[PDB]
Design a binder for this molecule. Structure first.
Ligand SMILES: [Zn+2]
Length: 55
């Protein structure tokens, strides 16, 4: 879980607006997973990298 961009997000399905306790998927057998089917393209860190070098 990340802390900053957004206060918090449903740790159940991974969708904002509601909490794991108020998550809809709860009352469902077949639901989607995470944000999308795609997890990553092929990079370690694109933005997560905040490292800076003056030289
Ligand atoms: Zn949810």
């Amino acid at each position: 879980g990340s802390s900053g961009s957004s206060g918090y997000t449903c740790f159940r399905c991974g969708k904002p607006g509601h909490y794991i306790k108020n998550c809809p998927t709860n009352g469902d057998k077949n639901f989607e997973s995470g944000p999308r089917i795609k997890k990553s393209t092929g990079i370690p860190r694109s933005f997560m990298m905040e490292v800076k070098d003056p030289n």
